[PDB]
Design a protein around this ligand. Structure first.
Ligand code: SF4
Ligand code: SF4
Ligand code: FES
Ligand code: FES
Lengths: 694, 216
């Protein structure tokens, strides 16, 4: 229950047991800080949050002192100002004059709080000099200049509590205390880059960005993170035509201040191996060509080949917008085809879970609902490589709650205790009608998280039928207040695809295609496209799909267009263009409209407003931006789509396999990254730097 | 100065195996029993000392073996072994001379003792002799400030020192039997004044049973 207290004369109210700094933040009172973070545990080592309380003789730490009723706080008086001055004097005693060569310059809390709450000049002139500290090698992503460490312990707290990487610590004692791995080890985690943002000094910095830019040079665009279906909200920092870095953004219901390393460091791939001009295959060579010539060639291929009905195949890959897929589907249907297809292994056939109700392919117990969790079952998903931030959320819940977690699948090096109980469908049914089934039944907020790798199997109906039966049989998993059936997607376009109906007929499932338009589709195998078919790759990077193509149309990347992306929850988010596309590249729906007009059809929209109206005509949830909708048809969906048409399928005994064999190098932008290549050579479990011999 | 970084060597690296002997493993299980079952990490300090006594110094393999035993990450053990200075993380000599140079032992003559030891062994604090016999280290107060100046050789306190006595003490620890601990040459017993006790002079103590309250 809330209490009442006074801070600088202002009366404010927060819950009991809260820290004083939280009250000061609610009251609009600014209090300094280096070691306090809203998402990390409370440490009281910087001694910069000191304020005066009438109760206490000495000044007390706002970060740690509990809030009490009737307490009177002052953050204004001479003792507090002198305290801040003294603490900054000691802090900058042994700090190095690296401000020109430091990459935190211009965005340093130490600089700003020295200017605001500290002295104008120093009194340290000792002839013996300052302390020195040797630089650590903790990997190819985080660069270390550890003379600048102020010993806040944010890195350690993050790595040991939020990430599950206990290799970072606090070795030594006193002035010779050094943060790092006591021996040369790597900071092996898919969340390591947030250490760079948490350090208020430049002791831990981005290595590929090391000296590229300063903060004031940068345009800051608030956009959305492709590379996973979490829809992490990001800030793209751009210097003209070049995207310099990507950093996280606050969204407490999606990603909560964090982003993974792919999202942060795959930006290096938007400036190499890009497609800047159209290309025509004349033989074993690609020949650069104009837009008119390439679209002319596509039209002539359509008229020479005469694909009847479902012989025109449309493939959409990861990292594609919704607008592009809608335009491609409208075109493909105007040409008489229903062979809209995903780049997954079993993408030629529609999903076993069906697309009739959105509840069947979404994370219905929303990302903030993991915090409500009491029991979790993980079917065919490693959340550390699929939606790592959601794995961090699962950990966060597990550390503060009674949370019992099980998994049916490959044995996964998890950041929590996971209770592995099988790898087959047999073991799934065993678990669901044995012990963990009753664990799920007696729970008040149980979660059954199914992976997309299950949909990428032939015997997926067997699974989804089993899980659907268990769901409709168990009230606790599906109520009028809570839905525990969740499907975790690993790529950012699948939810929007299924929302717009980007799946194939079964009439088209068995057709051999004569033309194959593949859009951002880099996971094709060279067996899903015939040797005698005319193929059209539309993308932004040449990795796999453009090698196959007969015509290549350069498109725009997610940093170069304002697209709509649907995440796992069903949350539609709108990006924002940071730059324009390079060279002769174009927005992709405009490409599809032009090539429609070159062909014997034409889409009825001509600018972005009409495309938004078409999105509304397809699904009105695609324009309710950032709103996660409930659904009224949970019972109906589990009875119609998951349990009904899947009883005919018989299970395999092939063990479940991991879906993402390398977290790094998952898509075109990452496979074109050299930083991801270095991070794939390193961060391999076979290396001695990445395994501590416990 | 405290060293807080490890660089692997051919005789100190995690590939070198380590294992408690059966005696020390029994003792370690008895030590783990002294704490709650879920808080067995509390035994990281005594078990590390057990390792440092089996093998003459706290090597990285000892830390990793303890971490394996107590189900704790190795870095949490590295932090302990680096924080507490009695964990010798470099190899040591047979005899670890620890001479206090704090203010009491300085007022009573620690610097003469340090000069004597440095001249006898031709060694500076933090170094080891050619004999692998004497490792020297100037330490803070070891809790024998009344019997000052003082020193400690491998866990035993030799007190109320002189340069003469320290020189010949090192001589007989270099070869032959080493004297029993306590004040030098029995010029004192323990904390008594060296002229003699002035307080506790009977030959039978007063039993407090004779002086209880009116209650009980
Ligand atoms: S961390 Fe901040 S104060 Fe320290 S050198 Fe870098 S920019 Fe300057
Ligand atoms: S390395 Fe950086 S984040 Fe970690 S304690 Fe030092 S200053 Fe803080
Ligand atoms: S913010 Fe309270 S001591 Fe650092
Ligand atoms: S001052 Fe030397 S033993 Fe304490």
């Amino acid at each position: 229950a809330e209490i009442e207290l006074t801070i600088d004369g202002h009366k404010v109210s927060i819950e009991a047991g809260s820290a004083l700094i939280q009250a000061c933040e609610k009251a609009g009172v600014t209090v300094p800080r280096y070691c306090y973070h809203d998402k990390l545990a409370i440490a009281g080592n910087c001694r910069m949050c000191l304020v005066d309380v009438e109760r206490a003789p000495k000044p007390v730490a706002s970060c740690a002192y509990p809030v009490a009723p009737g307490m009177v706080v002052r953050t204004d008086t001479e003792r507090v100002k002198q305290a801040r001055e003294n603490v900054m004097e000691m802090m900058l005693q042994n700090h190095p004059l690296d401000c020109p060569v430091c990459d935190q310059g211009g965005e340093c809390d130490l600089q700003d709080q020295s200017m605001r709450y500290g002295r104008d000049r120093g009194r340290f002139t000792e002839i013996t000099g300052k302390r020195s500290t040797e630089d650590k090698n903790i990997g190819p992503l985080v660069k270390t200049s550890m003379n600048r460490c102020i010993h806040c312990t944010r890195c350690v707290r993050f790595a040991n509590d939020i990430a599950g990487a206990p290799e970072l610590g606090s070795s030594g004692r006193g002035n010779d205390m050094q943060i790092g791995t006591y021996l040369e080890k790597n900071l092996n985690t898919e969340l390591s880059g947030n250490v760079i943002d948490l350090c208020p000094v430049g002791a831990l910095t981005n290595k590929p960005y090391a000296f590229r830019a300063r903060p004031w040079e940068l345009k800051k665009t608030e956009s959305i993170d492709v590379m996973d279906a979490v829809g992490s909200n990001i800030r793209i920092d751009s210097k003209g035509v070049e995207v310099m870095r990507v950093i996280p953004r606050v969204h407490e219901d999606v990603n909560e201040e964090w982003i993974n390393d792919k999202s942060r460091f795959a930006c290096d791939g938007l400036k190499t191996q890009r497609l800047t001009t159209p290309l025509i295959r004349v033989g074993d060579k690609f020949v650069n060509a104009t837009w008119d010539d390439a679209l002319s060639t596509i039209a002539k291929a359509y008229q020479q080949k005469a694909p009847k009905g479902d012989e025109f195949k449309a493939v959409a890959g990861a990292l594609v917008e919704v607008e592009s897929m809608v335009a491609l589907k409208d075109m493909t249907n105007a040409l008489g085809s229903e062979n809209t297809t995903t780049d997954t292994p079993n993408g030629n056939s529609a999903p076993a879970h069906g697309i009739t109700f959105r509840s069947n392919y979404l994370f219905n117990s929303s990302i903030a609902g993991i915090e409500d969790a009491d029991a979790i079952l993980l079917v065919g998903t490693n959340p550390r490589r699929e939606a790592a931030v959601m794995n961090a959320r699962i950990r966060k819940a597990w550390l503060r709650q009674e949370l019992e977690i099980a998994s049916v699948g490959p044995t996964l090096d998890a950041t929590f205790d996971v209770a592995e109980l099988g790898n087959t469908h047999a073991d799934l049914e065993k678990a669901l009608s044995g012990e963990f089934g009753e664990v799920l039944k007696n729970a008040k907020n149980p979660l059954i998280i199914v992976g997309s790798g299950i949909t990428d199997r032939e015997d997926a109906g067997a699974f989804f039928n089993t899980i659907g039966k268990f769901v409709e049989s168990t009230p606790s998993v599906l109520n009028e207040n809570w839905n525990g059936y969740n499907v975790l997607q690993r790529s950012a376009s699948r939810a929007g695809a299924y929302d717009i109906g980007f799946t194939p007929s079964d009439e088209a499932s068995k057709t051999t295609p004569k033309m194959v338009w593949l859009l951002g589709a880099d996971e094709v195998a060279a067996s899903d496209i015939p040797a005698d078919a005319f193929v059209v790759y539309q993308g932004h990077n040449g990795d796999v799909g453009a090698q196959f193509a007969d015509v290549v149309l350069p498109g725009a990347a997610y940093t170069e267009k304002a697209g709509t992306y649907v995440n796992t929850e069903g949350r539609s988010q709108i990006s924002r263009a940071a730059t324009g596309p390079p060279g002769g590249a174009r927005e992709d729906w405009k490409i599809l409209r032009a090539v429609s007009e070159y062909l014997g059809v034409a889409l009825p929209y001509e600018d972005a407003y009409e495309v938004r109206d078409r999105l509304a005509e397809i699904s009105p949830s695609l324009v309710r931006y950032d709103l996660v909708e409930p659904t009224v048809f949970g019972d109906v969906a589990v009875q119609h789509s998951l349990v009904g048409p899947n009883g005919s399928v018989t299970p395999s005994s092939a063990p479940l396999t991991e879906t993402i064999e390398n977290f790094y190098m998952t898509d075109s932008i990452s496979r074109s990254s050299p930083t991801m290549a270095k991070s794939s050579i390193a961060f391999n479990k076979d290396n001695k730097k990445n395994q501590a011999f416990a | 100065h405290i060293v807080s970084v490890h660089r692997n060597t051919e005789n100190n690296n995690p590939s070198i195996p380590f294992e408690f002997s059966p005696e020390n493993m029994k003792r370690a299980e008895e030590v783990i029993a002294k704490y709650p079952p879920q808080y067995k990490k509390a035994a990281v300090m005594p078990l590390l000392d057990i390792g440092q006594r089996q093998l003459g110094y706290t090597s990285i393999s000892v830390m990793n073996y303890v971490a394996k035993l107590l189900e704790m990450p190795p870095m949490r053990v590295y932090e302990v072994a680096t924080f507490y200075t009695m964990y010798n993380r470099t190899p040591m000599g047979r005899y670890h001379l620890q001479i206090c140079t704090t203010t009491p032992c300085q007022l009573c003559g620690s610097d003469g003792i340090m000069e004597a030891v440095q001249n006898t062994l031709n060694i500076k604090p933090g170094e080891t002799t050619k004999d692998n016999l004497f490792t020297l280290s100037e330490v803070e107060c070891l809790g024998a400030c009344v019997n000052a100046p003082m020193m400690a050789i491998n866990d035993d306190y030799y007190e109320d020192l002189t340069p003469e006595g320290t020189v010949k003490l090192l001589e007989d620890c270099k070869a032959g039997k080493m004297p029993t601990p306590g004040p030098e040459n029995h010029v004192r017993r323990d904390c008594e004044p060296a002229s003699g006790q002035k307080v506790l002079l009977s030959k039978e103590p007063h039993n407090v049973a004779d002086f209880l309250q009116e209650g009980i």
